[PDB]
From Swiss-Prot:
Protein name listed in UniProt: Albumin
Annotated residues for binding of (4Z,15Z)-bilirubin IXalpha: K238
Oligomer and partners: Interacts with FCGRT; this interaction regulates ALB homeostasis. Interacts with TASOR. In plasma, occurs in a covalently-linked complex with chromophore-bound alpha-1-microglobulin with molar ratio 1:2 and 1:1; this interaction does not prevent fatty acid binding to ALB.
Species of provenance: Homo sapiens
PTM comment text: Glycated in diabetic patients. Phosphorylated by FAM20C in the extracellular medium.
Length: 582
């Protein structure tokens, strides 16, 4: 209406408004202190209430971008603290806003956030729930400038619910810790998937994104009409562009418009949207973006009909290439909620390639008649890997599965630094303990989401510290060919062994007093180093050394005078194993 900020306040509610304003300011003024931001919040809230009481009160008719900018430019220490950013204030809207966005540092130099002790967190939570939570909201938001604010708020409420439930429990740490680790990972994953989609929209262009969206959206709303899914893909593409551009307000509006649309037409999109569409303005959007796939129609034809058998394939294709390929994807995607998105994209690209060659030949239909037969090996490839790897994880547990990945990948890319190989194989291991718990129908999508985040985490690291051309190839290659590229890595036959370093394989008794995690990684670090010293060893040989080491440790940690044992037997293990591995 006459006042946008009064309208947002009524929609949001005071509680959500204040949290959102805090997050928004923390994302732009990343270096200002908490107490400074808390004052900005109170001043904007008081102002908003003014407009709520009188829609025509001073400044109340000014747009949200202008109001937000003026407050930003109010910070007096602006130039001494952010320097160049201060010059933005001399500019006029909307050029001023653009100027602020260009200075959002996607990676500030702040200390790592450390997890305090359970008793300190709980006591602080109890003595002042609000500052405890708002303080951390601030610390997280300023470190992650592009993380969609409303989503950062949903996490805050889960966090709150974990402290309420656990700080009351008998064993607090036993209840809270695993919840914190689970919320952290989930936050790491959402972050990674977000920057991943933006990076793709920026590098590979709009088309590649619209393609990803048609596939994903068709699995989720299989009953929807193709004309409806195209509408949604178009609006969703605009939403991400603007949300990637970093403009919170613009992003928020497009998301709200889109969520109401889906709800008003929910009866012709999906049946799983009833729940979501009741929920509060701030949750509709989030719920709809994560909504489970709808049941697919039971009366559905065979793709081969319209895309292989019909004789007008090329006529329909040349009439509007992308659209035709869109309908293919839509058709294939909606009958396969069990396929990962990039698999569907690989099939569509195979089909495109085929049609490009065939439609320019004497007899089209003969050339492209056996295309569905060319998909078979593309589909079986990722499924076979899921079966093979999840079965292995069943036999060995998570830890031993992780060690198997360790030997496997250290051998493929011996150059990567040991700490990186250990971290990567560990997370790969956890993707196994997470997705293998699911039924065959929901595994590929699961693996795709968690694998995608582990892969760029790996690529980023390698982007900074290059060490292998094959890794760089996989890392810069199409985002659809990324996983197949890593799976195709072969054992490195060129690699020359690291000369033996006695220190690397000397273990002291401190390994006994150490915690499980720190203990596993001390052993896993030694394992990578073993393989890097004897890359020709066989599963049987290594397995023998690990069984020996295993014993070694256990024995020397339950015996009087540890330090001696580890030094006496240590020489024996190392001496013998060198002989075994020749
Ligand atoms: C839910 N969401 C917002 C998160 C909650 C708690 C910690 C999170 C972290 S993190 O701080 O634990 N870890 C970050 C950076 C760091 N300080 O170590 C990282 O390893 O990339 C990253 C991303 C999201 C997080
Ligand atoms: C509610 N409106 C505005 C939406 C916002 C963001 C993503 C949406 C999606 S989605 O399929 O891209 N959903 C994303 C989740 C996300 N990153 O937000 C995904 O599964 O990868 C579908 C339908 C509506 C969406
Ligand atoms: C998502 C914002 C809510 C803030 C509540 C977080 C409180 C827990 C602090 C622990 C953060 C340290 C990071 C970690 O978990 O290792
Ligand atoms: C409205 C329809 C837009 C979708 C166009 C379909 C094109 C499918 C080809 C797949 C391209 C893969 C993109 C990539 O390189 O990642
Ligand atoms: C001057 C400060 C203005 C406050 C900024 C908060 C505006 C965000 C609107 C929230 C809309 C929710 C959109 C969604 O569903 O994702
Ligand atoms: C850890 C578990 C291994 C996962 C197997 C890889 C399957 C990946 C499917 C995604 C894709 O199509 O590339
Ligand atoms: C560093 C090692 C590269 C990481 C490999 C991850 C790829 C996982 C796909 C499973 C596979 O085929 O091996
Ligand atoms: C060259 C001989 C060095 C011998 C050192 C052995 C180091 C490998 C031990 C790795 C740990 C095995 C895994 C486990 O015990 O769970």
């Amino acid at each position: 209406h006459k006042s946008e900020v009064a309208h947002r306040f009524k929609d949001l509610g005071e509680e959500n408004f204040k949290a959102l304003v805090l997050i928004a300011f923390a994302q732009y003024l990343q270096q200002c202190p908490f107490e400074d931001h808390v004052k900005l919040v109170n001043e904007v809230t008081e102002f908003a209430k003014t407009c709520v009481a009188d829609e025509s009160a001073e400044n109340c008719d000014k747009s949200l971008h202008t109001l937000f900018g003026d407050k930003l430019c109010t910070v007096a220490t602006l130039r001494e603290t952010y320097g160049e950013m201060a010059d933005c204030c001399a500019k006029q809207e909307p050029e001023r806003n653009e100027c602020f966005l260009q200075h959002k540092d996607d990676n500030p130099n702040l200390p790592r956030l450390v997890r305090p002790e359970v008793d300190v967190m709980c006591t602080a939570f109890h003595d002042n729930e609000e500052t405890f939570l708002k303080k951390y909201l601030y610390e997280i938001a300023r470190r992650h400038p592009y993380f969609y604010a409303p989503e950062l708020l949903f996490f805050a409420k889960r966090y709150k619910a974990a402290f309420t439930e656990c700080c009351q429990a008998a064993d607090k740490a036993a209840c809270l810790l695993p919840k914190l680790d689970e919320l952290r990972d989930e936050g790491k994953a959402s972050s990674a998937k977000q920057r991943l989609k933006c990076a793709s929209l920026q590098k590979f262009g709009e088309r590649a994104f619209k393609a990803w969206a048609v596939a994903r959206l068709s699995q989720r709303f299989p009953k929807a009409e193709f004309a409806e899914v195209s509408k949604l893909v178009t609006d969703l593409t605009k939403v991400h562009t603007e949300c990637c551009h970093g403009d919170l307000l613009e992003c928020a509006d497009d998301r709200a418009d889109l969520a109401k649309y889906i709800c008003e037409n929910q009866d012709s999109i999906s049946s799983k949207l009833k729940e979501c569409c009741e929920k509060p303005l701030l949750e509709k959007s989030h719920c709809i973006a994560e909504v489970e796939n709808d049941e697919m129609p039971a009366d559905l034809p065979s793709l081969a009909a319209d895309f292989v058998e019909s004789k007008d394939v090329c006529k329909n294709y040349a009439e509007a290439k992308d659209v035709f390929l869109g309908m293919f994807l839509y058709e294939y995607a909606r009958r396969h909620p069990d396929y990962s998105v990039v698999l569907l994209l690989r099939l569509a690209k195979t089909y495109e390639t085929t049609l490009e060659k065939c439609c320019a030949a004497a007899d089209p239909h003969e050339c492209y008649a056996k295309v569905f037969d060319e998909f078979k090996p593309l589909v079986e490839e990722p499924q076979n890997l899921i079966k093979q790897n999840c079965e292995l994880f069943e036999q060995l547990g998570e830890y031993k599965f992780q060690n198997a990945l360790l030997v496997r990948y250290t051998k493929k890319v011996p150059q990567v630094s040991t700490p990186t190989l250990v971290e990567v194989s560990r997370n790969l291991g956890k993707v196994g303990s997470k997705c293998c718990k699911h039924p065959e129908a929901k595994r590929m999508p699961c693996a795709e989401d968690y694998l995608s985040v582990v892969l760029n985490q790996l690529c980023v690291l390698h982007e900074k510290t290059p060490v292998s051309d094959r890794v760089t190839k996989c890392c810069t290659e199409s985002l659809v060919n990324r996983r197949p590229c890593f799976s195709a890595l072969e054992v490195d036959e060129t690699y020359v062994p690291k000369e033996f370093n006695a220190e690397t394989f000397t273990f002291h008794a401190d390994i006994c007093t150490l915690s499980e995690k720190e203990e596993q990684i001390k052993k896993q670090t030694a394992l990578v180093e073993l393989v890097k010293h004897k890359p020709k060893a066989t599963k049987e040989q290594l397995k023998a050394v690990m069984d020996d080491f295993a014993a070694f440790v256990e024995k020397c940690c339950k015996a009087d005078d540890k330090e001696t044992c580890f030094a006496e037997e240590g020489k024996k293990l190392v001496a013998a194993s060198q002989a075994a591995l020749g």
